[PDB]
Structure 1
Amino acid sequence: VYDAEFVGSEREFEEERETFLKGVKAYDGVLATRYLMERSSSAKDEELLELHQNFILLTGSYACSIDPTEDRYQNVIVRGVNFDERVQRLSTGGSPARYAIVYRRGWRAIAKALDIDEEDVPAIEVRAVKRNPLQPALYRILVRYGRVDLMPVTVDEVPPEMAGEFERLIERYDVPIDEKEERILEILRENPWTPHDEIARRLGLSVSEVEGEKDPESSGIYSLWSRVVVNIEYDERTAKRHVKRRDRLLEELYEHLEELSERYLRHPLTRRWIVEHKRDIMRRYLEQRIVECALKLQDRYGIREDVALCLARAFDGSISMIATTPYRTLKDVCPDLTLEEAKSVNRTLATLIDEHGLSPDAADELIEHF
């Protein structure tokens, strides 16, 4: 289930909606730009890319403004888990709403708390990896801690130490780093935009072990960045300049899109055209996401072709969702899955059975109920 009720006031309600709607508009810009990029290699053009990344920045910016008093929502569930209690028992607390939205399809709970009915499938996602102008993990953490100040609004504003030189920021604050984090940092030094599953696979870890809790007291890359960000004192002044700047940026970015679109496709890409082909566009990305995932499962995890496509389909092309799923669920939706296959893609499963001697069932509910 996906759910959340609005407990804020009426003034706060129409602020949220207004923040959400602008975010939805920003993320549509990400979808539209990606559609263009994948229509020639000559397109995959730095102007386009930069326009794409400015959209990622604005989506991220609005996303940071959600629940600014950190008390406007309650009972926030994303795929069953209750993010309220979770966020309560974390040293640094925070907004369960913003916490949610960093998860894939987490926006649905906030979608139901407000009554977003303007365009269908009103997604806001803040999970871009390979084209994100920021160090991806940091980008997500900024959203979690609602750092409107720190989140850049244009690509040219993006400081090196928040992208390819991310380590400078970590080191510029006097933050401790455990052994597991050092190993993770070593991979991001080669390529800061390495996906987390790929980092996991290489280090012999699970995605959760790589990520850690989005709190300084945990261990992992989310944890490390949480540790950094809470020692960066807030700059209410820059938050103001950002918040006041962006609505106009957003509009020129769309105008940029229409103009620049003509260089590739004969039917110009308008704001209206994006709203009216919302479904088909995402269906397009879901297809790619499924093909890639099947390809990855077969080649990188050694999974037979039929089963790969089966899992790829059941979990809408998200390997991290496959990896963190219980064997029982995995096997229900893909009858022919073998245990070795499941262990090959679920490190937690593998670590519980192999190193700890548990049965499938016992690992399965450790996996569910952490």
Structure 2
Amino acid sequence: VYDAEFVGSEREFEEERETFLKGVKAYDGVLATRYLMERSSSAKNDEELLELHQNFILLTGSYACSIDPTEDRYQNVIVRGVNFDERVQRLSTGGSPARYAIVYRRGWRAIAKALDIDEEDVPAIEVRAVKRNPLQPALYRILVRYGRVDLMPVTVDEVPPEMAGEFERLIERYDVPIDEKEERILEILRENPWTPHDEIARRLGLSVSEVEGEKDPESSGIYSLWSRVVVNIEYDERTAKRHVKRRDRLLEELYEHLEELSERYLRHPLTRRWIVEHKRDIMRRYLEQRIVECALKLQDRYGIREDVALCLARAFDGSISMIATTPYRTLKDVCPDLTLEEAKSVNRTLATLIDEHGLSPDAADELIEHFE
């Protein structure tokens, strides 16, 4: 249920494969640094390691920005059964269905198939870091969706304050209009720019869909507001060029660094060779943490029964936001014991459509799938 066709030229194929494989290697660094951070307290409080982790988050984002530069190299990008070509074709600013997909958890599974990627196990690229993302997270995701290689920083030091804690400066810089709901979201982000979307939604009594919006200026929500801002920023090829030049060298340096640093914390240093060989373990430890955190939150903040909570957490790699924007049928198919009541608690869109607007679950599910 994760598919895409590569429809570019052979030259474009080698370009895309190279970008993707570098992105996978960068994301492996996110996973390997997290592995070390979770295995050792002295490593987790070592600033040198935390900077490595953040720098890998940036390079992953940068490489993801470079996917499908011509916005025509892929066809029928389907993630968990949902066709993103159809999604992106409707939007006022259009764009790449491949990059649109990569910002969703497991989007990489479609693109990896298209590119025949077999160079390592579970060749993932995820661009959804929140906690320790050096950028304001929704902005980071929007840069990826718009292919903004020019704007995505390639080192933590080089993150502009306006893309992080001073994010409100970037919004003000073009005096884009902000809707009332968006202003409510910005209030929460002032308190912590890294507040997760599910929490913003819970705190405002809104659905996750309402908090997020479409990734297009014409919509309403944090993705929509950042899209509004970013389309006003002229594309800077000179800076994109600089970023592309440096990032490949930086990627090597981050790995060399990680290996060195890991030697004083581990009996088995995190060499690139070791990371590739133990990729499945690295990935599964990363996911297990997210899954259990998610399950606990689902049961305590949404009233979901313990077993269903763990089932949903597992199916969606620990993303409450994903769960909260998924059709009822899709959730039930993976987690049979889920009740409609429970689904309405986590996906408030379902509650609004069925309870307030009087749609059948099936009609509600059509809208949630096609239009999210």
Query: What's the TM-score bracket when you normalise by the shorter of the two chains?
Result: over 0.9
For the residue of structure 2 that corresponds to 1:77, the secondary structure is: strand
Distance in 1 between residues matched to 2:90 and 2:336, nearest whole Å:
38
Report deviation, 1:334.
4.0
**Are the structure 2 counterparts of residues 233 and 356 from structure 1 closer, same or farther at C-alpha, using a change threshold of 3 Å?**
same
C-alpha distance 294-236 of structure 1, shift in aligned 2 (>3 A): same
Cα 1:79–1:262 change in 2 (3 A) is same
Name the SS of the counterpart of 2:39 in structure 1.
Answer: coil
Q: How many Å separate the matches in 1 of 2:311 and 2:73? A: 40
Q: 1:314-334, CA deviations, whole angstroms, 9 ceiling, x for partnerless residues?
A: 444332232223334444544
Distance in 2 between residues matched to 1:359 and 1:135, nearest whole Å = 37
1:83 deviates by 1.5
> Closer, same or farther in 2 for the Cα pair 1:335/1:246, shift >3 Å?
closer
For the 8 Å contact 2:82–2:369, the answer to whether it is kept is: no
Q: Which moved more, 1:74-83 or 1:251-260?
A: 74-83
**CA 1:18–1:360: 2 relative to 1, 3 Å:** closer
CA contact (8 A) 2:3 2:114 kept: yes
Single out whichever of 40-49 and 127-136 deviates more from structure 2: 40-49
Counterparts of 2:307 and 2:64, CA distance in 1: 38
Q: Label 1:331 to 1:257 Cα distance change in 2 as closer, same or farther (>3 A).
A: same
CA distance in 2, matches of 1:136, 1:314: 23
Q: Deviations over 1:141-163 (max 9, x none)?
A: 11111111111111111111000
Q: CA deviation at 1:5?
A: 1.4
Give TM-score, length-normalised by structure 2: 0.95
Deviation at 1:301, TM superposition (A): 1.1
CA offset digits 1:55-111 (Å, max 9, x no partner):
011111111111112222222222222222221221111111111111111111111
Deviation at 1:335, TM superposition (A): 4.4
2 CA distance for matches of 1:76 and 1:329? 18
**How far does the alpha carbon of each residue in 1:173-195 deviate from its partner, in whole angstroms, 9 at most, with x for none?**
12110011001111111110011
| Structure 1 residue matching 2:149: 3-state secondary structure | coil
**1:263 to partner: Cα distance:** 2.5
Task: Supply the distance in 1 between the matched residues of 2:266 and 2:129 (Cα, whole angstroms).
Answer: 24
Counting matched residue pairs gives 370
TM-score (norm 1): 0.95
User: Equivalents in 2 of 1:9, 1:269: separation in Å?
Assistant: 37
Q: Against the structure 1 CA distance between its residues 259 and 18, is the aligned structure 2 distance closer, same or farther, given a 3 Å change threshold?
A: same
CA contact (8 A) 2:208 2:347 kept: no
After superposing the two structures, state which structure 1 stretch, 334-343 or 179-188, moved more.
334-343
Q: Give the C-alpha shift of residue 357 in structure 1.
A: 3.5
1:348 Cα deviation from its structure 2 partner: 1.2
The 3 A distance-change label for structure 1 pair 149 and 272 is: same
Q: 2:108 touches 2:124 (CA, 8 Å); kept in 1? A: yes
Post-superposition shift, 1:283? 1.2
| 1:347–1:268 distance in 2 versus 1, CA, 3 Å | same
Q: Look up the match of 1:173.
A: 174
Structure 2 CA distance for aligned equivalents of residues 35 and 287 of structure 1: 11
Aligned to 1:105: 106
Determine the C-alpha separation between the residues in 2 that align with 1:343 and 1:6.
37
1:310–1:152 distance in 2 versus 1, CA, 3 Å? closer
1:308 is displaced (CA, Å) by: 2.2
Q: Give the 3-state SS of the residue equivalent to 2:52 in structure 1.
A: helix
Distance change >3 Å, CA 124–CA 316, structure 1 → 2: closer
Indicate conservation of the 8 Å contact 2:213/2:220, yes or no: yes
| Larger displacement relative to structure 2 (315-324 or 201-210) | 315-324
Structure 1 residues 234 and 333 mapped into 2: Cα distance closer, same or farther (>3 Å)?
A: closer
Q: Following the alignment from structure 2 to structure 1, what is the Cα–Cα distance between the partners of residues 118 and 333?
A: 35
3-state DSSP of counterpart to 2:41:
coil
Structure 2 CA distance for partners of 1:356 and 1:135, relative to 1, 3 Å: same
Distance 1:22 1:263, change over 3 A: same
Q: Give me the identity figure in percent.
A: 100
CA distance in 2, matches of 1:348, 1:254: 43
Instruction: Compute the displacement of 1:309 (Å).
Output: 2.5
Do the aligned partners of residues 361 and 22 (structure 1) sit closer, same or farther apart at CA in structure 2, a change above 3 Å counting? closer
Residue 27 of structure 1 and its aligned partner are, at CA, apart by 0.6
1:187-219, Cα deviation, whole Å (9 max, x unpaired): 111110011111111111121111111111111
Structure 1 portions without partners, runs of 5+: none
* Bigger shift: residues 127-136 or 102-111: 102-111
Q: Secondary structure of 1:53's match?
A: helix
Change in 2 beyond 3 A, CA 1:297/1:101: same
203-212 or 152-161, which deviates more: 203-212
Shift of 1:6: 1.6
**Unmatched tracts of structure 2, length 5 or more:** none
Q: Distance in 2 between matches of 1:169 and 1:178?
A: 16
What SS does structure 1 have at the residue aligned with 2:293? helix
When structure 1 is superposed on structure 2, of 318-327 and 254-263 the one drifting more is 318-327
Distance 1:361 1:145, change over 3 A: closer
Structure 1: distance between partners of 2:26 and 2:51: 14
Contact kept? 2:87, 2:370, Cα under 8 Å: no
Q: Distance in 2 between matches of 1:21 and 1:201?
A: 37
What whole-Å deviation, never above 9, does each CA across 1:206-255 have from its counterpart, x for those lacking one? 21111111111111111111111111111111111111111111101001
